[PDB]
């Protein structure tokens, strides 16, 4: 029973209720004028001001307008400025302000709102959980870690804080440490804990430590609608796209691209070798904590469908070749990159983020022994000048145990069943 009416607002409760009804019934433009009149007669009224903000919120939804939402965001702020705001209404208004600030990508501003909310309600642990999510969204795992520690100091049983703390630990490569927190947080069943991200990383942490229990959690995640399957564990998915670990060129439909990669493979190889020899610093160590051991670096020509101009200066013929194929240069959920691994390298079993791409590998320098890739239950080898294709949303793994280096060219393509408008509008990954 949220108490939103301060003493004066109770004296005008009738007019407020009539205005909110118009907003309930959907007469948006009618309610913005009803609440404008209430804001006129009663300029200090928090409930009138909240009505104006909610209507501005709904108007941003119909019109799909960032500018009108900015105005709503300010009005939600104005509610909190007025005298004598009831606590429930104050909390409702600033929470919704932060949420819509996150909508707009004003992640720094959302953070100030959340920090104020925690300052205003230091006993609300859920507001602290929300604050930590704000830190997580701007990539500040350090402050997010501290926040969930503080939650757990006061409410050790809070499941939301548990999983988020585990997520952070796991992201920090505190693999063993993260398992109990992720596991207990999911088992709590608290709101916000039934999230694919936590099934994803609990199972992966279990795998890395050798806990055969890892797949129990993948099944539960599949059963709760988060994973397409136990083997295919991507989280940014389009449902219905055909799903198989290995593809032939013909199945993908990108027959002309495969032809061109294989016909011109040595120019791609030679430019890659030239960068190894003369510009080796362009190869960057893979830094997503996917390397179990060894030496593994990548030289990226395209990411998120954008050409890296300086990188293409080091592979000019290759970039010229690839420009003819928007199915890969426009794959805003994939990359185009050389990859090199040296002997004694092992890539952890892992999954890519999206089922919306397929990953091509063109072999460039493949030692005759020592090198292999598993996708799902099938392990294959590369050939120099030949293309392999797999769906890297399926769990896959690579070993490099040869006596010399391994070099391939990676070309991501849109999943062939994605329509042109899907390819144009899916957010970049």
């Amino acid at each position: 029973k949220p108490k939103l009416l301060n003493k004066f607002d109770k004296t005008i409760k009738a007019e407020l209720d009539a205005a909110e009804k118009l907003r309930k019934r959907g007469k948006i433009e009618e309610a913005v004028n009803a609440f404008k009149e209430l804001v006129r007669k009663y300029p200090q009224s928090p409930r009138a001001r909240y009505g104006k903000a909610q209507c501005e919120d709904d108007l941003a939804e119909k019109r799909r307008s960032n500018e009108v939402l900015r105005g709503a965001i300010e009005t939600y702020q104005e509610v909190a400025s007025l005298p004598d705001v009831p606590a429930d209404l104050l909390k409702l208004s600033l929470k919704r302000r932060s949420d819509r600030q996150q909508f707009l990508g004003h992640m720094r501003g959302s953070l100030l709102t959340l920090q104020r909310l925690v300052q205003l309600f230091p006993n609300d642990t859920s507001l602290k959980n929300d604050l930590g999510v704000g830190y997580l969204l701007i990539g500040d795992n350090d402050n997010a870690k501290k926040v969930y520690e503080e939650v757990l100091s006061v409410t050790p049983n809070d499941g939301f804080a548990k999983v988020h703390y585990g997520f952070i630990l796991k992201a920090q490569n505190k693999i063993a440490e993260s398992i109990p927190y992720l596991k207990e947080g999911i088992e709590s069943g608290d709101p916000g804990t039934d999230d694919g991200r936590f099934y994803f990383h609990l199972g992966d942490a279990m795998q890395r430590v050798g806990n055969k229990e890892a797949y129990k959690w993948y099944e539960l995640g599949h059963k709760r609608g988060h994973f397409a399957s136990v083997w295919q564990r991507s989280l940014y998915n389009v449902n219905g796209l055909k799903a198989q670990p290995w593809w032939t060129p013909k199945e993908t439909g990108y027959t002309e691209l495969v032809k061109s990669l294989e016909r011109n493979w040595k120019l791609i190889r030679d430019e890659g070798l030239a960068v190894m020899d003369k510009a080796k610093g362009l190869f960057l160590p893979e830094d997503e904590n996917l390397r179990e051991k060894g030496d593994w670096s990548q030289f990226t020509l395209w990411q998120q469908g954008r050409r890296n101009e300086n990188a293409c200066k080091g592979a000019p013929k290759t970039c010229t070749l690839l420009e003819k194929f928007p199915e890969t240069t426009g794959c805003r959920r994939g990359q185009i990159k050389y990859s090199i691994m040296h002997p004694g390298t092992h890539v952890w079993p892992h999954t890519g983020p999206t089922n919306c791409r397929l990953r091509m590998h063109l072999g460039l320098v493949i030692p005759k022994e020592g090198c292999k890739i598993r996708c799902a239950n099938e392990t294959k080898t590369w050939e120099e000048g030949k293309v392999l294709i797999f769906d890297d949303s399926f769990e896959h793994e690579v070993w490099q145990d040869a006596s010399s280096f391994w070099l391939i060219f990676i070309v991501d393509v849109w999943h062939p069943e994605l329509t042109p408008q899907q390819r144009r509008s899916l957010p970049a990954i």
Binding site: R64, S65, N66, L69, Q102, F103, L104, G105, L136, L137, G139, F167, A171, R197, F200, H201, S234, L235, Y236, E286, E288, N289, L290, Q303, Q304, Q335, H350, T351, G352, P353, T354, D392, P427, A428, I429
Partner: peptide, 18 residues
């Protein structure tokens, strides 16, 4: 940070309003 090869980030996309 960006989710190129994996799913390590809390969110892999960036919201830019409507």
């Amino acid at each position: 940070g960006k989710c190129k090869d994996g799913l390590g980030e809390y969110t892999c996309t960036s919201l830019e309003g409507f």
